[PDB]
Each structure stands twice: as structure tokens, then as C-alpha cells.
Curated annotation (Swiss-Prot), chains A, B:
Fe cation binds at residues 608, 610, 660. Coiled coil: none annotated. Changing residue 656 to R: Loss of lysyl hydroxylase activity and decreased glycosyltransferase activity. This is Multifunctional procollagen lysine hydroxylase and glycosyltransferase LH3. Disulfide bonds join 234-237, 329-335, 513-639. It is a peripheral membrane protein. Homodimer.
């Protein structure tokens, strides 16, 4: 039984990158001793050769040399030394599928049955004496290949047998990922994750993301060895910092017509971060949003430490605008953090900026998804063309079956970047631009090209993404038509704030007349925009029974029937079934129309029955302020609703029993919305 | 100016028939002096010749000889004498269109332009001396024609010129009806009626219904001269009597299957006449009515002085049965009046027998019509074939625009006959039988053949006639299907007695639950016969909405849909419009059915909505006596109708609001009738 205190791990690193630190944390988890050369590829052997002179006689010592930037450790020193002894080798190299650099040498390699045949110098383990005898032979220069130097020495059949050199053909200790991606799966335990090679049924110690397998290693690195575990949750999510706070440049990008932009702009005033510590940059590419931004700008200027607007007049491309905002932070030594936030990102968590800063990463994004769907502001995997690909754990992340902070190949729409990273590691201006590749992908490639991890946190609920795809802007109030595409935000803007409480009970609903129910339905903004949309149409004027017309406009005339029918199904239907227990509705309504009452034209509506099972009657403006005059009188009951409430609706039967009358409007203008449901 | 005291009217009569008395009353109206020969046709001249010897020298005297049985006087003696002087004749005969008996003598008659050419001995006026010179020449015998005797003397041209004989060619004084029916119309005044000859524009004094114009004279006799006047009403209706009362034989004839016979039999017990003075004869030709009559017979026997039933077993024809009943009165000297009453005659006036007896006629019928139509129990006129013909005043009589007691050619279904008339004037037994002519016409001919008037009184409202035409007897309770043909009697039997008061108001209708109305609709007899008709069918088992069947029978299965739909239109529709002001109904209902609740089969009905605008729910039996168990529960109201009332119906909305439940029937059997109206 070899002594773990006799095992030394040697690696090379010239900077403490995130990949090097990820390797080190995996080594510390298993209590390895690590010796790092070069913190102050032929240069690797030069440093190792020098380092090995101290151990030229140490037959008692076992040394494992591995890369660090693209390596993680998955097993303990005890298991590692046990497998090394089981190999019966005195210096065991990692094996792989490809013979590089010299392809011609593939002939001299011994025949291997089912295992890997060729050597890989990214990982080997052996006695210090044997290793010293190999690396002392290096005399070349730093730019010459170390793989071929180790190669050439191995294919010397006399030296291979003298020093007992071997390759780990079946990945018992070393797992090189290149050419073996389909052999490697995660193997889970309670508080630990490692990999299994399903082709050889081994549990390797060293995971080497050699070649173009860096993202596959980033994926494995999110779990192995203590990254995320079924019982402890994620391991580095808590350890890395899970009076005044840092100064932030907040950059907002409006690159397309976007629903609910006034709501987004107002939400910027609500973010829970000292506004005297935030500098706002806003780029707007759309003339459609200029009034929205002009409306909000006085509040934004009074809120934040400084503000800057770059408008459509400047004709900046999205990539040119993102380069500009990011460089404004880069060239300002007081910008400690850069917060990029796209207009289609809805932040429900107002502490999002604090939470992301505390995670203490170079680059980190909050996870945001389209409501109820899988599409999110990140990708788990890339196609070889850098097109989207679904990763093995993407659904679990999006559905928050697994929460944590994840190393991912692509993020978008919202991220927080350390300002010192922009200055020291990505100093160039062409981060998003400079190629015909998409600006958002060019950004991610730029960071991946520097070995900077792109982190994604689903540790908290942060918000959602708006659908902007086919946002029809040919309306006076286009967000009225957003009931299908963004129903969550449509509800928060247009459905009455106290509706849900009324639907759930709590005594909001009233019964002012027998079997006439009264509940809040529409917000004041919905009422104003619906009225304004009706008057914008302008062409004013039904299924009533007396023994009966109104000046009105039907939803179909203005192209709002399908939308109003959706509101009926989603909000009125459930309300009716709660208030008339035993009745069930699909919210059929052929008659949906706004009627206008004025003393100048039609001020009243004579007694009648509606052609409906029940009628919805929503006031749309204020009694007293917008009109003087009565509301609705149900004759068989001697009951009048004298004071209608703007966003509140009446629910009453349409036939037989509720003969009703529209009392004359005596001043101003009275607008109501009425649907004859279930005819 | 000739003196009216110098005018003597001479007529002949061997008995004081109604026609003679009608003539006399018309003579008394104008204050004529009448000398009647023979109260103790050649015999007419013999009596006149003898009578004239007293006046052979009376040049101061004017004498008018007229028949009496078929004559009425229409003008005064003053007008008569004025016209006689204007004629410039000394003996003026009536003229007519036909030369009888000898047709050959038509040549010797003087040419007449537009007027009547030939003589008629039924009426003439002249000086007593001139008349004596003519009638003293008669020496023949009583069976020889008087017309030819007067004829032959007139066509003697020398005697015609010597005595100044003339004919009333243009009907200035005498109006013979035969051959001039289209020349004669009534001329009305305030308190007097006479005739005008429109062909000559005259106002005759003497109306002679000679030949086959006796019925036309009877028609004129109903008005002329003081018969019926626009301002005094009828003149003989009041004058002829308009402790114990006379004994009556009441004869009832059931000659066809007749609706509501139990009601007729019960009504016999209600007639306002001392039953100890009435003897009941009832003939029933129908086996269908034997149970009806057997049911009633103990009450009838205990009510009347004596009773006799002649059943279908005897195989009497209608004419043989009417002869038998009438002869039972004829051969009984204690039968002072015979009252014949057909089963299809509904007497609403319970004093009908008293009223008709008081009118003091030989034969008189109360006017009865089919409800709302013109057909009645009398004819105003006959075709020459004795088929029905409409008279000039028939509609006025039927509509009671003119009321009185009318001399008519035909009566049926109800009449009161003086018993002494049967004994002394119509002693034969073959009154209705003896020929292939219809029994009811043979009866009328028999009386007309004896100069007996058939009177008809519409002075009061007496009753109506049932439709019996196509009475379908293939039912357990055939009168249930009589809603179309006899709706007045159908209502009195089957509609709840307090329905009409409830429809008119008066606080009968109740509202036990909100918008559930409760009113009496069906009589207990309707409920029992409907239930019994359902069980007679036997084959027990819908448009309900829950989140829902019943053991029931639909009206269509038993052939009662059209009838029930008529009840809905006539009685439920108006009730619904009164109780739901503003709602209007045509009473559409596709679902009409009786459901049965029993603990053994289906005892309850789970909560549901009906497929209807409103639902009619009529209990059909008694809670407690027929079943134990609850009724109807409306869930949204916490309101139960625990005690249903047998003939009462519930009226409630069918959709949205009145989710309702049929509480379990725990004993017996519960029957209800339900219609889903206006689906
Ligand atoms: C929704 O309901 C809330 C509370 O039921 C309303 O807020 C109240 O408004 C009155 C005056 O308008 C205040 O005196 C109360 O203190 C408020 N309550 C709370 C809890 O703030 C609110 O106005 C309703 N929304 C709308 C649109 O009418
Ligand atoms: C129709 O209504 C009348 C009166 O409203 C009911 O007759 C009453 O019946 C009660 C007992 O049943 C008596 O005490 C009253 O004196 C009766 N009133 C009269 C005026 O006679 C009658 O029962 C109702 N008809 C039905 C079929 O229920
Ligand atoms: C690492 O070593 C320490 C003692 O220095 C020990 O307490 C700890 O449990 C070890 N951890 C592992 C994973 O071996
Ligand atoms: C008939 O004569 C009487 C007098 O005797 C007279 O009062 C009456 O008015 C007369 N009537 C007519 C109709 O001439
Ligand atoms: O003015 C009102 O409140 C009644 C409107 C109404 O009943 C209708 O539009 O049918
Ligand atoms: O039993 C009752 O009273 C309810 C009957 C009912 O609602 C129905 O027949 O639809
Ligand atoms: Fe209405
Ligand atoms: Fe029902
Ligand atoms: Mn490497
Ligand atoms: Mn309209
Ligand atoms: Mn005569
Ligand atoms: Mn049924």
C-alpha cells in the first residue's frame, strides 16, 4: 500500500485562470499536494526537468504530471495510487485516440485491442526516478513540441522495456475527452460526482478536456467532483461569497420594438441598489420607443447618478452600441461592475444586481426564461457550427430541478461583468463587432477565447423574457394586443390589480342587485387605452329584445374580437363559474362592443333583454369626472346601480328576469364595454 | 175623408190558431174593428154572403175582407181608407202574379203594364153595397173554389164596369207574397215596422203570405207591425207573461258519443226547478256512456220525482226514442210541459226551464250556439229542399243584436212543449219517425204542418252547444283531448278553478323562492286523469346540464304533445308574461314529460340546470297521501319547496341561476309534470 504523502502532483500554469483554480479546488477536495510550476509546450518540460533534479533519487516518490487549465480531478490519491500499482508500470502515460503531431508514428505503436493506442503528454504518473530519467533528456527549446519528445522516447522499444513505460489504454486513471465524448458519462453519488467510461467500465481519476472538448469539460466541471451534488446542492455556489456597494454602469439596449417598454423603464427605478452608485446608459434603436423613453427620461435622470441616451439618430448597430456601452465602463476606472440588460428582460427579483455581484464571478447572468417554455437567455451546448444545441442537463436547469451557478457556453439579455476583467483581460473594443457573426455570439466567443467562464445562476428566481417576435406596432396602443404573446405581463398591466383576490374570495365581489354581481376586472390603463382605441377608430354606430340600438363600436370592426374573447375565456369565465355555482362556460360571445352615451347623441337605452345567458357590463370611465348621469336599472327589482366603478364589471342574467334600462347620461361622455355571453 | 168608424174588417177562422191570433194583434195595434166569421173555400163566401145581408144598403160602410191565418196588417185604417179612395174603385181586389185556378182565363184579364195582373180573393176592400151585390150571387157549395167565383165575376166586362171593380195591381194596399218575394223588404221606424214593395215603391197595408210563403210571413211577422222595434225591443216578448209550478217531463237524449257527459249529468241536478215536479226520461244510444250514466243514476233517482233509463240494449233509433219520450208526456194528463234536452246542449242559465215556461208558448227553444261561431240550435230559413239556408236576420239573432222571441222554421237540441198541444194538436205518435227524413226535421215539419209556431228565445243568455263531430273515444279519458274542440268546457273541467283569479292578480300567486313563482294551474281531475293516462301507457323510462335522466314519459309518446302545447300557449304563456314583466313567449317546448319518483326505482334528481329559458313544474298528486318526500331545492338560494300543492305549478328560470335538485321521495309515488319552455 503506497503512502499518499509520497505522491506529488506537478502542473504548469502561468496565470491563475478560472480553469486553473477549478483544477486546484478539485485537487484540494481530495487532499492532494499540488506543485505548480511557472506562476511567476516545450517550456513545460524545461520547468519539469529542472524541478525533477531535486527528486532524481527519490524512488520512494510517485509523481503525477497533468495540465491544469483543462483538467479536473475525479478520484482520491489512495484510489489513484492503487490503480497505478495495479498497472504494474513505472511511468504510465495517458492514452488517446489520435497520434499527434506525427501521424506516421502510428505504426511503431504496439497493437492495442479495444483500448486507446497513442500517447498523450497532458497526463502521466510514475516513480520520481523513472520520470527524472525521461525528462532529464530534454535539451530543446520552449516552442518545440513536448508531445513528440515524450512520444519519441516511448516508441524506443528498448527504453520502453528498460524503464517499464506504459499507456493507460482503457482510461483507468486518465480520461482524455477528445475522440471519446461518447464514452464518458457522469456517475452520481450523494455528495460527490465523478465520471464513468462506459466503453471500458472504469472510473478515471483525471479528466482532461484536451483538444476541442473544453466546453464538455466545463459541463463535467459543473458537477465533478463537488460541483453540484444531489444532496448538498452545488458546492461552489455557497463558498464564493454566495459599507457602500460597488459603482455600476447599467447599460440598457432597445434593439427591436419591445412590448411593455414603459413598464421596463419604470422598473429601472425600482431595482434594489443605491441609485447614486449606478450610471445609466440606454441605447434605443427604435423610433417607436422614442416617446416611451422621452416620457421616462426625467425620472431616470433624477434617479441615477448619471444618465446617457443614444438614440436612433446615431444609427448604431446593436454590436456597435454594445461595444460602446461596455467600453464606457472599461475606460472608467471607477466602473467596478458592468450590468447589461436588454429591453425584453423582465426582472421580477429587484435584488438581482446585488445577488449577481455577491456571487463574485468575472461574468455571470441570471437565468431568465420565456414564461412556461424552455427557451432561456443561455445555451447549455453548441453545435460544431456554433448553432444552438440542447445539452444533457439543459431542461433540468431551465426547470430548476438542479439549481446553482453553471459554467455555460452562451449567455444573453442580462449579465454582470467585472470591470477589471474588461480592462485587464478583454481590453479590445471589438467585443461584439468586427465580424459577420452575430453580436451576441461574438461576445460569448470573445470571453471563451480568453478562457473566461460565462456563469449562469438559477439559484434564485430572477425574472422572465418577453416575446418580441412578431410584435405588431400598427396600433394606437399595441400592448393591448399582447394578451396571447405575453399574458403574464398583459395581466399585470391590463387586468385589475384586485381581480385575483376577488376571484379567490375575500369579499371583494358585491351583489348590488339580486343576481347582479359586481367585481373588478380591468385596470384604469386598460379602460383608457380601450376607449382611446375606440375613438381613434371613430366610426360609431344589436341583439336586444324589447316588446333596440346603441351608438357603439364592435370589437370585430377594430380587430380586437379574438383578443377580447381571450380575456373572456381567461378571466370572466372563471369568475362566472365561481359566482353561479353549477354553471359552466366556454365564454362564447358574438356581441362584444363598446357603447358611448352622450346627451348630444344617444344618452339612454330603453328597457330590454339581452340576447345572452349572461351579460358582462364593464364601465370604462369615471362617473362625475367624465360623465354625469345614471347607470343601469333592473326594473323587476326596483334596483339601480347609480354609481358605477370605472374598472368594475356587472354580471347579470340576460333573459327572462333582468329587464334592464340604461339611465340617461346627462353630461360628458359615458363609455361601457358589454358582451352578450353564451347566446 | 172617410170615417174609420165606417170601416169593418171581416175575416174567417174556425179556430184561434197562433196565426189567427197574430193577425188579430196586428189589427188591434191599429185599432181596427174585426168581425170574425166561423169561430164556432166556398164556405167562406157562404158565411160572408150571409153576413152581408145586414149591410146590403150600407153605402156609408167600407168593408175589407181578408184571410186571417196567413195575414198581418201593416198600416192604419186612416191610411187604408185614404188609399182606397185614391184608387177610385168601389170594390178593390188584391192582385198577384199567377192566374189560378183556371190558367186559361189569363187572356180575358185586362193588360197591365208593370203591375200584377190577376185577382186574389184572399183580400179585397169595397163599399158594403157593392160587396153585397157580388157575394149575394154565390149559390154553390162549400168545397167549390171561391177564387174562381170572384174571378169569373171580375172578368165579366159589363159587370166590372157597372160596379167599378178593380185590382190593386201595384200593391198599394194588399201585398200578396207568392211570386213577389224579391219585391218585399222590411221598412223600420222607431216603434213600428212595416214593409215596402221596392218594385212599385209602395207601403202596403195587408201582408198576405199566400201559397208557399208561410215562412216568409212568419219572418215578417216577427217585426210587423210591433213585433220587434229598434227602440222598444220586441213587443210580444213582454206582453205574453215574459204556488207550485207545473209538472214537467224532462227527456234527455244521448244519441252520439258526447264530450263532458258526466258534467251534463251533474248539471241536471243543478237546474233551478223543483225536482219533485220533474220526471226524468233518459235515452242513451252509446255503450261508451253507460258507465257515465250508471255513475250518475243514484243521484238522479234521489233527485227527481221519477226516473227512467232506456239503454243501448233496446236498439231504439233516435226518432223512435224521441217519439217514445214525447208520447210518455202526451199520454200522461199530469205532464203539463215536455222539456227535451240533448246531451250536447250546455245550459249555463239554470233558470232556463222557468224562463221558457213563463213565455207561455206552445213550442219554444232557448237559443244555443257553438261558442264563438254562428252555428246554433235553430235555422232562420229553409231551402226549397228543406236544407239549411241563412235568413236575412240570422246573424243579428245569433249575435244578439236583436233579442226577443222569434217565429222560426227549425229548432233543435232543447225545447219546451206544452203537453196539451201534444194531446190536442199533435196526437200522433210518429212525430220524429215514419219517413226517411231526418228525425229532427220531421219533428219541425210535424208542427209546421199543423200551423204550430216554433219559437226561439234569445232574450237571455241560455248556454251553448258542444262540438261532438269527431270526438275521439280511443282514450282512457277522452275529454283530456278536448282542448281544441270545446275549450270553454275543457277549461272549466281541467284548468284550476282559481287560475283566472291568479292570472288577474288578487294575491294568489306566491314567490316561495327568489324568481320561483307558484300558481294554481290544473284541477285535481286534470291531475288524476293525466297520471292515470300515463300509467295506462305504462312504458316508463333528457335536456339537463350538470357539470341527468329521469324515469319519465313524454307527451309525444302518448299522443298528447299538441294538446299540452295548446295549454302552454293559452294558460302558461300569459301567466309568465304577467309574472316576468318585459318577457314575451310563444310557449315553445320540445321537452314535455311526466316524471315518476319512487323509492323502488328513481327517488331523486341530482342538481342540474334545465335546457330552457324557464321551466314549468306542476305537481300532480298529494304530498302525504300519495307520497312522502321532499320537492325541489334551489341550491344557490338555500330555498326548498318542501310542501308542493297538487294542482299548482312552479315557474323558475332554467339556466345559469337556478341550479336545482329533486329531493328524494321516501314513500309512495310522486308524479310531476315538467316542460322546458323556450329552449
Ligand atoms: C385594491 O384594494 C386595495 C385595498 O383593498 C385598495 O387600496 C386602498 O385604498 C384606500 C383609498 O383608495 C386606502 O384608504 C387604503 O388604505 C388602501 N388599502 C391598502 C391595503 O393600501 C386599492 O385602491 C384597490 N385598487 C384599486 C385599483 O381600486
Ligand atoms: C280557491 O280559493 C278558494 C278561496 O280562496 C278556496 O276556498 C276556501 O277553502 C277553505 C278551506 O279549503 C275554506 O276555509 C274557505 O272558506 C274557502 N273559501 C271560499 C270563498 O269558499 C278553494 O279551496 C280554492 N280552490 C282550490 C281547488 O283549492
Ligand atoms: C483532508 O485532511 C483533513 C486533515 O488534514 C481531514 O480532516 C479531512 O477529512 C480530509 N478530507 C478528505 C476528503 O480526505
Ligand atoms: C186606439 O184608441 C184609443 C182610444 O180608444 C187611443 O187611446 C189609442 O191611442 C189608439 N191607438 C192607436 C194606435 O190609434
Ligand atoms: O347602460 C347600461 O348600463 C345598460 C347597457 C345594456 O344593457 C346593453 O348594452 O345591452
Ligand atoms: O323534482 C323536482 O321538483 C325537480 C324536477 C326537475 O327539475 C326536472 O324534471 O328537470
Ligand atoms: Fe342590455
Ligand atoms: Fe330541472
Ligand atoms: Mn490540456
Ligand atoms: Mn351595435
Ligand atoms: Mn190566405
Ligand atoms: Mn325523459
Amino acid at each position: 500500500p503506497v503512502n499518499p504523502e509520497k505522491l506529488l502532483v506537478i502542473t504548469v500554469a502561468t496565470a491563475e485562470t478560472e480553469g486553473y483554480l477549478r483544477f486546484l479546488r478539485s485537487a484540494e477536495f481530495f487532499n492532494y499536494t499540488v506543485r505548480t510550476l511557472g506562476l511567476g509546450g516545450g517550456q513545460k518540460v524545461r520547468w519539469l526537468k529542472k524541478e525533477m533534479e531535486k527528486y532524481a533519487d527519490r524512488e520512494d516518490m510517485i509523481i503525477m504530471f497533468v495540465d491544469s487549465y483543462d483538467v479536473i480531478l475525479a478520484g482520491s490519491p489512495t484510489e489513484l495510487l492503487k490503480k497505478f500499482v495495479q498497472s504494474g508500470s513505472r511511468l504510465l502515460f495517458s492514452a488517446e485516440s489520435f497520434c499527434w503531431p506525427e501521424w506516421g508514428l502510428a505504426e511503431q505503436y504496439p497493437e492495442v485491442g479495444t483500448g486507446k493506442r497513442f500517447l498523450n503528454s497532458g497526463g502521466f504518473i510514475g516513480f520520481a526516478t523513472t520520470i527524472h530519467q525521461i525528462v532529464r533528456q530534454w535539451k530543446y527549446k520552449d516552442d518545440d513540441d513536448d508531445q513528440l519528445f515524450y512520444t519519441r522516447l516511448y516508441l524506443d522499444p528498448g527504453l520502453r522495456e528498460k524503464l517499464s513505460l506504459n499507456l493507460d489504454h482503457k482510461s483507468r486513471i486518465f480520461q482524455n475527452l477528445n475522440g471519446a465524448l461518447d464514452e464518458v458519462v457522469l456517475k452520481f453519488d450523494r455528495n460527490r460526482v465523478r465520471i464513468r467510461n462506459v466503453a471500458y467500465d472504469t472510473l478515471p481519476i483525471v479528466v482532461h478536456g484536451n483538444g476541442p472538448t473544453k466546453l464538455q469539460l466545463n459541463y463535467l466541471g459543473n458537477y465533478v467532483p463537488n460541483g453540484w451534488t444531489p444532496e448538498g446542492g452545488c458546492g461552489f455556489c455557497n463558498q464564493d461569497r454566495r459599507q457602500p456597494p460597488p459603482r455600476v454602469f447599467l447599460a440598457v439596449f432597445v434593439e427591436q420594438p419591445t412590448p411593455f417598454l414603459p413598464r421596463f423603464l419604470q422598473r429601472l427605478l425600482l431595482l434594489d441598489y443605491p441609485p447614486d452608485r449606478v450610471t445609466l446608459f440606454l441605447h434605443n434603436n427604435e423610433v417607436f420607443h422614442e416617446p416611451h423613453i422621452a416620457d421616462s427620461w426625467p425620472q431616470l435622470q433624477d434617479h441615477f447618478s448619471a444618465v446617457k441616451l443614444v438614440g436612433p439618430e446615431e444609427a448604431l448597430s446593436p454590436g456597435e452600441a454594445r461595444d460602446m456601452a461596455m467600453d464606457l465602463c472599461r475606460q472608467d476606472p471607477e466602473c467596478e461592475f458592468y450590468f447589461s440588460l436588454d429591453a425584453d428582460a423582465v426582472l421580477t427579483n429587484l435584488q438581482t444586481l446585488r445577488i449577481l455581484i455577491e456571487e463574485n464571478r468575472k461574468v455571470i447572468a441570471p437565468m431568465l426564461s420565456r414564461h412556461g417554455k424552455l427557451w432561456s437567455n443561455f445555451w447549455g451546448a453548441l453545435s460544431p457550427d456554433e448553432y444552438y444545441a440542447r445539452s444533457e442537463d439543459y431542461v433540468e436547469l431551465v426547470q430548476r430541478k438542479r439549481v446553482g451557478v453553471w459554467n455555460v457556453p452562451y449567455i444573453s439579455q442580462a449579465y454582470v461583468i467585472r470591470g477589471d476583467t474588461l480592462r485587464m483581460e478583454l481590453p479590445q473594443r471589438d467585443v461584439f463587432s468586427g465580424s459577420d457573426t452575430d453580436p451576441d455570439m461574438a461576445f460569448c466567443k470573445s470571453f471563451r477565447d480568453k478562457g473566461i467562464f460565462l456563469h449562469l445562476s438559477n439559484q434564485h428566481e430572477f425574472g422572465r423574457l418577453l416575446a418580441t417576435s412578431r410584435y405588431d406596432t400598427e396600433h394606437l396602443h399595441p400592448d393591448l394586443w399582447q394578451i396571447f404573446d405575453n399574458p403574464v405581463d398583459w395581466k399585470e398591466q391590463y387586468i385589475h390589480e384586485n381581480y385575483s383576490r376577488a376571484l379567490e374570495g375575500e369579499g371583494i365581489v358585491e351583489q348590488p342587485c339580486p343576481d347582479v354581481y359586481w367585481f373588478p376586472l380591468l385596470s384604469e390603463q386598460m379602460c383608457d387605452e380601450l376607449v382611446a382605441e375606440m375613438e381613434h377608430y371613430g366610426q360609431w354606430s344589436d341583439s336586444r329584445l324589447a316588446g333596440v340600438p346603441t351608438v357603439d363600436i364592435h370589437m370585430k370592426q377594430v380587430g380586437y374580437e379574438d383578443q377580447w374573447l381571450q380575456l373572456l375565456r381567461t378571466y370572466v369565465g372563471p369568475m362566472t363559474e365561481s359566482l353561479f355555482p353549477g354553471y359552466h362556460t366556454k365564454a362564447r360571445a358574438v356581441m362584444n362592443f363598446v357603447v358611448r352615451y352622450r346627451p348630444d347623441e344617444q344618452p339612454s337605452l330603453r328597457p330590454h333583454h339581452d340576447s345572452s345567458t349572461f351579460t358582462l357590463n364593464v364601465a370604462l370611465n369615471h362617473k362625475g369626472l367624465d360623465y354625469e348621469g345614471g347607470g343601469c336599472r333592473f326594473l323587476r327589482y326596483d334596483c339601480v346601480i347609480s354609481s358605477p366603478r370605472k374598472g368594475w364589471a356587472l354580471l347579470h342574467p340576460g333573459r327572462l328576469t333582468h329587464y334592464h334600462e340604461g339611465l340617461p347620461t346627462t353630461w360628458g361622455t359615458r363609455y361601457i364595454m358589454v358582451s352578450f355571453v353564451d347566446p
